[PDB]
Amino acid sequence: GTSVKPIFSRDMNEAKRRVRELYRAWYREVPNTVHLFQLDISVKQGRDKVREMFMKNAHVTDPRVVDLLVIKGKMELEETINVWKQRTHIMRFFHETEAPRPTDFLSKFYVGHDP
Amino acid sequence: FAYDGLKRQRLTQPMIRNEKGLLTYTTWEDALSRVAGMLQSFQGNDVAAIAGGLVDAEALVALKDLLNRVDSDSLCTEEVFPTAGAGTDLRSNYLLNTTIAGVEEADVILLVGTNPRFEAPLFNARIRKSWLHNDLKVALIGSPVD
């Protein structure tokens, strides 16, 4: 039962393939989305935001899912290009308001019963 | 009928003694600093522990590890169990080996120094069921309790 239907990625390379131009478009996308949307964010930290998003999920090996984030990431890009998304939506990725969650067991302990 | 005990006299804050030796509400830093300071300059037999009765094994592992890294391996308990012989050595010496689910077919039970009616009510319930059905013959040494 290991053999199942693929979406677009017949192999790993095609999954690697689709990630490529997805970043090609998105890397070409950061400077202007800031420019039109009047975001007070420099281009540089916009670009590597896409970078660490890209390997915040670049750990799974199943070829059926990796291209599903490709189309999901593909269309999260489409919604941004044509001023559908607003200032709150672009900034929403740039997490601002919440304090950093605890790092050491000392900080987990001092906040509360939460782990 | 023990949930109401949870609400009465419940410790909620790090409780330390003030300059008058009166227990007072303080943050975690003071309580942590108080214990940490007096344990650094004390090793070996200078540190020990007294195990309670209702503390999980997870804290037991932590307190064994905490004392042994200080080389304070004197992890003492409350219920005194004779160390002479193989008490702590062999698990058989401190186990209900036959298991409560197994005591059914036993012909005779020699209870030694026990009042299971109150000492362990669930244990006494299982004997009574086996007493009524399996014709179990119990035998208690000591007080002629009910």
Partner: protein, 209 residues
């Protein structure tokens, strides 16, 4: 049916859908797994995933079936079943005033080629399924998040998605803009355990599986 409490049954059409169900079953036995009708004169014929094109193309074009009115494109999550997502079609015949209903099974990833050709009504429904349940459909003209919020995360009608959600919103002065903080409810949803532990209906009871 002298008693007025229960609704009367209607047998003449009840046999008619079953006859039509076998009629559809014999024509295309490659894709019909099983067909059955319920008490309330509602027939359902069950199709295989890759069968969205011809079965509807059948019902849309057959001279003796001609079911063209696309009713609804629903999905029903069943976590127990491996293919938890169950895409459900529904067609109405104008001339024969009947309601066919075909449903398939699909995993989270496995696609369905878009049935916008047989019914362009499905196109706008198709957007909702990937928004509402999240099942992607193959070769769809424009399959968009159309009903949920912009840049939402996940699929809310997956039964693993909290009713309250994951992100709450508020207007923040220090940014002069709406910021999406994680949810922090004023009151917790007081779930109610509403399941009588006695047998409800001996009829529909599941035997020891």
């Amino acid at each position: 049916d002298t008693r007025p409490t229960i609704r009367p049954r209607n047998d003449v059409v009840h046999k008619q859908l079953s006859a039509f169900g076998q009629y559809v079953a014999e024509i295309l036995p490659k894709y019909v797994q099983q067909v059955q009708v319920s008490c309330f004169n509602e027939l359902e014929i069950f199709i295989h995933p890759d069968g969205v094109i011809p079965v509807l193309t059948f019902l849309r074009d057959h001279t003796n079936a001609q079911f063209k009115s696309l009713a609804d494109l629903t999905a029903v999550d069943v976590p127990t079943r491996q293919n938890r997502f169950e895409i459900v079609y529904n067609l109405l015949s104008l001339r024969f005033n009947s309601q066919i209903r075909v449903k398939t099974y699909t995993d989270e990833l496995t696609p369905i080629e878009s049935s916008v050709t047989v019914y362009k009504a499905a196109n706008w429904y198709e957007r909702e399924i990937w928004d509402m349940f999240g099942v992607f459909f193959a070769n769809h003209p424009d399959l968009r998040r159309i009903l949920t919020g912009y840049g939402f995360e996940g699929h809310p009608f997956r039964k693993d998605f909290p009713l309250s959600g994951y992100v709450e919103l508020r207007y923040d002065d220090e940014v002069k803009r709406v910021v999406a903080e994680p949810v922090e409810l004023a009151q917790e949803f007081r779930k109610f355990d509403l399941n009588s532990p006695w047998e409800a209906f001996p009829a529909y009871r599941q035997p020891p599986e």
